[PDB]
Design a binder for this molecule. Structure first.
Ligand code: KTW
Ligand code: KTW
Ligand code: KTW
Ligand code: KTW
Ligand code: KTW
Ligand code: KTW
Ligand code: KTW
Ligand code: KTW
Ligand code: CA
Ligand code: CA
Ligand code: CL
Ligand code: CL
Ligand code: MG
Ligand code: MG
Ligand code: MG
Ligand code: MG
Ligand code: MG
Ligand code: MG
Ligand code: MG
Ligand code: MG
Lengths: 12, 232, 232, 12
């Protein structure tokens, strides 16, 4: 949906 | 607990093996068992706990968004199946968040006295409330959002008092709190201000770092820059 | 069965949703429930069953090979953990293979009278014995290999009598049987001969196909070519 | 270990 950068594994 | 009979050291060894095998559900179950031994976690062990559950909840968030998007199309019924299956995935996601918050509350946060441990755990508490907020719609959504904000705020206050501005835990906290502001709290100005101040204060501290600490800091500073590029 | 109370049509709809969400464990559980309704499967439903379990067992095979490789390094002990965790993953893989073989034996294969259905199911029976053979080491390994060969051979005999040489089910069967020969039965010459004859007979039948059938056939013919390029 | 091409999802 446009997920913004958050910490750690980009697992979604 | 199913891991009650396994040695703490064997649970940690097996969490590391599960990570190599990309078996993140196993990795999380091993780390839950390690936490329930009741000993504080080392820095490496806290990272294994976080990586395991982030991977598990990541897959659930991705599935939930796919099903939510189909449900919304399907209401713009053709039967209860899309809603039933979105609810099933949502309930499983909520149970993983509940499990992580339960470990933090019993008793990781209360025994964590060092800034590194306490900020790490309060950031995680923020993150798992934020994952709950992403799917919340009821009389609970305001209270879940406030629980996320409260955990992130206590973590920020400690991090500003106890850690340098380039500390990767402090940086990853500020990154996550800014995304919370932007898309959970509907506060894009707060998100942009936090991301900018965090970026600029880290930039000015990079000169103090070794080459290894500099790589760790600048990797997270790049995520703050990537968000600011989308937001401004 | 946990899916006993759900409508067959709802199980199939939810299998399709789980596939879009990359929830392959859910997809497999829904398709197992659909099979246990006792009605024959359509072509689309047989493909949903196969895709679900192939994805689940795929993740288990990949994890098993990682752990087996570490175990072998670790024996070239440092405690029982690597072996215990490889055994845990192996047992889970064997249970998924057992579940699929149980569905085929009760009662998909026995009611399948059309060549398309019967070859599809016998190929799957071959594949799941082959997955069992990949991890077999005991007094059972010979018998598991023979069970794979027997299922693949009956599927091949029917496919040669009833289907054209470009039929994608026939082609995917011959691909899989050739890999069986190469690395389970230690028969690389059989594997190469099968892959070559299959490729060449399909090539000579492509002129009979529509543009859509031609894409379906040539996609599998490319996999036969890729293996022959590694083997010769 | 070098896995050869087999039918359907390359899920391993
Ligand atoms: N994925 C992992 N196993 C680990 C990640 C980290 C991090 Cl990010 C810091 C210190 C230690 C570790 S161990
Ligand atoms: N995936 C792993 N095995 C590791 C990852 C990390 C990180 Cl990210 C930092 C420090 C240590 C480690 S060890
Ligand atoms: N699954 C959920 N909706 C929630 C889990 C928790 C926990 Cl564990 C503590 C306090 C609040 C909450 S709300
Ligand atoms: N402190 C500022 N004025 C800004 C910094 C950035 C960055 Cl770092 C990326 C994109 C946009 C902006 S605006
Ligand atoms: N992945 C799926 N949902 C499907 C795959 C196929 C194939 Cl390969 C043939 C006929 C029908 C279908 S439906
Ligand atoms: N992934 C899907 N939704 C589908 C895949 C296929 C294939 Cl592979 C063939 C015929 C039909 C379909 S529908
Ligand atoms: N898990 C296993 N080792 C096996 C499963 C089956 C089945 Cl289900 C039928 C005949 C033979 C076998 S061997
Ligand atoms: N029928 C033959 N002589 C051969 C066919 C192929 C192909 Cl198709 C690829 C690589 C090698 C070979 S040898
Ligand atoms: Ca989400
Ligand atoms: Ca394997
Ligand atoms: Cl459901
Ligand atoms: Cl284990
Ligand atoms: Mg336990
Ligand atoms: Mg002990
Ligand atoms: Mg709900
Ligand atoms: Mg403004
Ligand atoms: Mg059932
Ligand atoms: Mg009915
Ligand atoms: Mg075994
Ligand atoms: Mg030769």
């Amino acid at each position: 949906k446009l997920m913004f950068k958050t910490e750690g594994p980009d697992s979604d | 607990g199913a891991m009650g009979s396994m040695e703490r050291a064997s649970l940690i060894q097996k969490a590391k093996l599960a990570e190599q095998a990309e078996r993140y559900e196993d990795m999380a179950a091993f780390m839950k068992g390690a936490v329930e031994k009741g000993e504080e976690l080392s820095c490496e062990e806290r990272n294994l706990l976080s990586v395991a559950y982030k991977n598990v909840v990541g897959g659930q968030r991705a599935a939930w968004r796919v099903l939510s998007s189909i449900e919304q199309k399907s209401n713009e019924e053709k039967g209860p199946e899309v809603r039933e299956y979105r609810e099933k995935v949502e309930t499983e996601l909520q149970g993983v968040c509940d499990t992580v918050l339960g470990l933090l509350d019993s008793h990781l946060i209360k025994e964590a006295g060092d800034a590194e441990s306490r900020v790490f755990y309060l950031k995680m508490k923020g993150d798992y409330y934020r994952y709950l907020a992403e799917v919340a719609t009821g009389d609970d959504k305001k209270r879940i959002i406030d629980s996320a904000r409260s955990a992130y705020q206590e973590a920020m206050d400690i991090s500003k008092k106890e850690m340098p501005p380039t500390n990767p835990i402090r940086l990853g906290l500020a990154l996550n709190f800014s995304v919370f502001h932007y898309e959970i709290a509907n506060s894009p100005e707060e998100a942009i201000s936090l991301a900018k101040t965090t970026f600029d204060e880290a930039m000015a501290d990079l000169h103090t770092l070794s080459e290894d600490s500099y790589k760790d800091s600048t990797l997270i500073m790049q995520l703050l820059r990537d968000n600011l590029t989308l937001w401004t």
